[PDB]
């Protein structure tokens, strides 16, 4: 489902996902031990977000001219 209980989880998952990519990018820059483990988890999360965003409903795209003429 893609209502509110999932979209709320899909919003937390994006915040945690982009943190792990950047931490993984920092560890890779510094050549620290677990650099590619964090890049795996961070990049996989961002690919999950991108996948599930294709099924989201398109934006309502409200029109205001028809109710506020010549805007």
């Amino acid at each position: 489902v893609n209502g509110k209980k999932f979209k709320n989880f899909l919003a937390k998952l994006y915040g945690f996902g982009a943190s792990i990519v950047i931490l993984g990018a920092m560890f890779k820059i510094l050549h620290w031990t677990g650099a590619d483990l964090m890049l795996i988890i961070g990049l996989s999360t961002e690919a999950v977000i991108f996948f599930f965003s294709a099924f989201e409903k398109p934006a309502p795209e409200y029109d205001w001219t028809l109710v506020y003429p010549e805007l």
């Binding site: 990519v21 950047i22 993984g24 990018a25 890779k28 820059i29 050549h31 650099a35 590619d36 890049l39 990049l43 961002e46 991108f50 934006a59 795209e61």
Partner: protein
């Protein structure tokens, strides 16, 4: 709604992060270390091979010293100087590794390979810098080898080229030999330079003894 530029940015910053991770996935200092090990192994091969020429001199002059002993003595003097300089440079390498953190417990490599502060002060600052002593002994070795080659052949060009302590101009700016060799370099690059000087010493010893062998 997101603009087409913004969607591209959102999808591309992760790809650029991956490209950055691929850009820096290799430590170029570990490459210098491994190449230093290869150079050290080849120098060991060279000195193993020239250890047999010493046995050759020993056996040649142990049967008729009237013609070969005068060249063994002229050769073992080269051996002593070359070994002393090699031991000096090895001690300098050990000192550089020691003041930086020593040999890593697991990787069997110096702990600080990018510790160009202590390296720089040891080579160029402390007590005037150890590099001045390096060039002094290099010049001494070069002169002694020149006076142990009584032919004035192309070996002189070799000796002047390998041990070229003369000033080198970068951008029409004068810098000493010790500054054009050890400045702004990490420990991972200085050790290969000292090992290259050791390789030059071994090559000079080898091709001076070779010339000094075909005169017996």
């Amino acid at each position: 709604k997101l603009s087409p530029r913004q969607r591209m940015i959102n999808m591309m910053y992760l790809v650029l992060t991956a490209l950055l991770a691929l850009n820096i996935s290799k430590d170029i200092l570990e490459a210098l270390t491994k190449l230093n090990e290869d150079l050290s192994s080849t120098v060991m091969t060279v000195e193993k091979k020239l250890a047999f020429i010493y046995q050759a001199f020993d056996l040649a002059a142990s049967e008729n010293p009237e013609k070969a002993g005068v060249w063994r003595d002229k050769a073992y003097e080269v051996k002593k100087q070359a070994d002393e300089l090699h031991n000096y440079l090895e001690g300098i390498k050990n000192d550089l590794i020691e003041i930086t953190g020593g040999i890593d417990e697991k990787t069997n490599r110096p702990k600080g390979l990018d510790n160009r502060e202590k390296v720089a002060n040891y080579l160029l600052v402390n007590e005037g810098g150890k590099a001045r002593e390096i060039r002094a002994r290099l010049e001494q070795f070069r002169d002694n080898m020149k006076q142990y080659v009584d032919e004035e052949a192309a070996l002189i060009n070799m000796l002047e080229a390998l041990f070229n302590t003369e000033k080198k101009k970068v951008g029409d700016v004068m810098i000493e030999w010790e500054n054009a060799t050890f400045e702004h370099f990490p420990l991972a690059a200085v050790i290969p330079f000292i090992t290259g000087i050791q390789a030059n010493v071994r090559n000079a010893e080898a091709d001076i003894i070779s010339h000094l062998q075909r005169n017996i």
